[PDB]
Design a protein around this nucleic acid. Sequence first.
DNA 1: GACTTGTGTATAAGAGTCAG
DNA 2: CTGACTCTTATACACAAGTC
DNA 3: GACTTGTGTATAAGAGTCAG
DNA 4: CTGACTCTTATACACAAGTC
Lengths: 458, 458
Amino acid sequence: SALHRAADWAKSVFSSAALGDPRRTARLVNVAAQLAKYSGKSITISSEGSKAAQEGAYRFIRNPNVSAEAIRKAGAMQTVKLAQEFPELLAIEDTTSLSYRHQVAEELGKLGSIQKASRGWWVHSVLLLEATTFRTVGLLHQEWWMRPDDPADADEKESGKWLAAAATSRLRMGSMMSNVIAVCDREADIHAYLQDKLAHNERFVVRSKHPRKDVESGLYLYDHLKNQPELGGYQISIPQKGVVDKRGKRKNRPARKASLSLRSGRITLKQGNITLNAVLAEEINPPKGETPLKWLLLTSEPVESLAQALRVIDIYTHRWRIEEFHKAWKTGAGAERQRMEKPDNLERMVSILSFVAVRLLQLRESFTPPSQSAETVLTPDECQLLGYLDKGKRKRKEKAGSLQWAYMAIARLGGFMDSKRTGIASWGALWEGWEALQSKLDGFLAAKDLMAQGIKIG
Amino acid sequence: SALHRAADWAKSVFSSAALGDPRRTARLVNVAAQLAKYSGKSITISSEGSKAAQEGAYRFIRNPNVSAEAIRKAGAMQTVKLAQEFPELLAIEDTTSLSYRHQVAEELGKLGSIQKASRGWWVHSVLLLEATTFRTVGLLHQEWWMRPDDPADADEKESGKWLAAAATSRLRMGSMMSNVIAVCDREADIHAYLQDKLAHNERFVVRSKHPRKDVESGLYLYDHLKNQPELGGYQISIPQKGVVDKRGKRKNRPARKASLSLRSGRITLKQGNITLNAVLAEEINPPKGETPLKWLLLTSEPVESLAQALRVIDIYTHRWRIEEFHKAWKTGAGAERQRMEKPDNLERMVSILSFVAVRLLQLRESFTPPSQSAETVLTPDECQLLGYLDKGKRKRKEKAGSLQWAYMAIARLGGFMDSKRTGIASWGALWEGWEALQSKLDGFLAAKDLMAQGIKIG
DNA sequence: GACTTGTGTATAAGAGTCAG
DNA sequence: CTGACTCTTATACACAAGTC
DNA sequence: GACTTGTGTATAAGAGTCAG
DNA sequence: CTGACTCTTATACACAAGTC
Ligand SMILES: [Mg+2]
Ligand SMILES: [Mg+2]
Ligand SMILES: [Mg+2]
Ligand SMILES: [Mg+2]
Ligand SMILES: [Mn+2]
Ligand SMILES: [Mn+2]
Ligand SMILES: [Mn+2]
Ligand SMILES: [Mn+2]
């Protein structure tokens, strides 16, 4: 694991970039490390006062000989490298936009109405997770494009995104593709997409949107499914949250436990006369005034038993990870905070950030246990200092010196107060905590050094 | 000076609050220290994981027995205390708004159109500076109010703000009022205001807005002034900046040197037949396409010689400090980032922040020299660590171990790269640097401690 | 003296944000 | 697109420490 | 070998933000 | 309300270190 040490991390992710000059590759690694060390901050701040590094970083982000595609490819190859270690993987796939309003926006693509000031890119990503513990492995692919003002000018239909993602995946994963399960939201409810996966014997979990007919029974998927015997079901704890509409009316969404029934079955679609499985999760005795929870999922996976169908549900529930990634890239890494003047420059910088973003998520996961000493992830110095810092804050529930303790102590460092008592700290708080730990390490290490050379302190 | 040590700072500013219970007073001090230590962050983060402190802080901000007015008064009394030390003071006076859009906004006052979602308060402040070195002393007064949707419902004209500010000032400053020079923008070009100052024999510098006539010559102030002989003049370096209009068109404002002529004279206004002086600064051979620089200032101060008139100009140029304060309160302390649910709660919290804001400015000023050792402001440990940290970053121009060095080293810590080569770091960068210093101090001090108890490190 | 009010610890949840 | 949090405002108890 | 391209140091300034 | 900055993109030189 090259994660905690930014520099090592950077090297692991980008050392193989094929930029056409070993010098650009080394710079990319260096640029990425500083950004990673100063997650979310500006290039300048990341430079720690080094003129040369600052100049180096800017020169690189505007280097017309550096391909952003090649930079994203490099990091993707590392994900592939890492993926060899797991028998089953989840390929989470979704689209987001990168929005800007500064001068360059004029040179970017449409995101809303033709007149909107905010313009930028649509980015279709594939986020790989290991299917046993669901940890985040890394990005596998990104497709970036600018939507034209006039659809007529489009080079191709955007719906082809899924398929291009699959082609890239399959080619980067080679013989590992068989261990991959593609996870997509309703937008992927495209028969052409389904056909293709099936044709390659590839795996997937796609939520259904359209009313489709089941060839055998001739009923609509939903109906055919309602006819299937209940397998059992499951419960979900829906947490409280405040809600605001399009108009800005605010209202509360109190917490609640939802009970769902689970049914599954085999279906067949006319298109290519393809066969696949389906699962239907639907809320029983839904509240008086709430929109019932309902998921109709299409899949390649087994669904016969309650266990197999629930497995499908668990898989689809992991799709949300990509949403966290979106936020980590934006709010976390600062994707939309960048102010490069030319599309290509901004693209280069932002591409690097996509990796920083995945790291933000991994950091947290690294502190998340499945009683494993904290010494497994931290240095002895990190340990010592942390202990010092946490003095007296440890709760009974936390085994002294454990991985669990390190997690809370770091979060605490980050301000975490477990307000809802879930025990779960945000990836933002954890980063905040780690950042503080690291900062304080510098001071600690500075003292240590001075003593080592017989120097008196203060 | 109780500035650098947050706690001591808090005590100095608020220890005399008259809250009706010594317990609320001690809490206020404590609340303020944590906020000051964690400038700009949330109450929770400021709590360093302490449930009791967090609970204490919230309880206080919603305590119906705590008067926000009393909290602002307390800090103002400290400014008064401090003011005794200077022979001449500048009372900078201006209005800003505090804007919110969350649920409470409905309970706040109008700031724009009757329908605007953003509502909140208008706050008229007096910011005291020492007139020799222009350092920031502190806040002297704040008047907060909610503007009614219908003017008809207003309790009084908002124009009375200046006068109420003067009444409060005079009463808090007592015999020191004579050393005070009131500094106000054109909005203060109110004859009733002028009369009042004059009547109390009080001093001021008010920019002129309206065309007024000079009783003696019977010409308009501007004209009468143009007739006065030129005293000499002055130059200004107008720096480059990007500019954006109301509509969002962006355009450059390149740097330039402006040459101004200076004239002065005595004038008399019909209202109360009052006499006062005036100065007129007007740009000579102004550029082809720029809006000419022009200041017509009304004052109590001497204007006869070039020196005396320039003095007036320098004074008025210091008005901008209040603008920095506005930003420090908002962007810096987080005034508008607060999300308290009731007007009174938000008011209490935000009132505390106004002091935090002044401190942000003072911090910087504290590192600003007029070759005074850094040891005058920093601890030996702070010094040592800082030196360690800055290793190799010092520029020749900076005398090793000086106040000047500490300034740059801290700024550097804050990311400063002197992009425009002015040599001046923002108050934001300086805080960032100080914050880092402090953070790193914790680690340093933690090491020091451990050694002291024979413990091996890492 | 007779009553309130704050604190440190507990429990719980509404309000607000940026991802959808 | 079946969310995941933090900020903010309560509630309760056994004291402490305030007011009038 | 014959030409480009990056680096560390320099100089300068346009673009963008939140205060007005 | 006569702004004060940081972020970002150049320019130039003497080398170094790349490509083809
Ligand atoms: Mg295989
Ligand atoms: Mg931080
Ligand atoms: Mg006097
Ligand atoms: Mg900071
Ligand atoms: Mn989607
Ligand atoms: Mn004003
Ligand atoms: Mn999405
Ligand atoms: Mn103003």
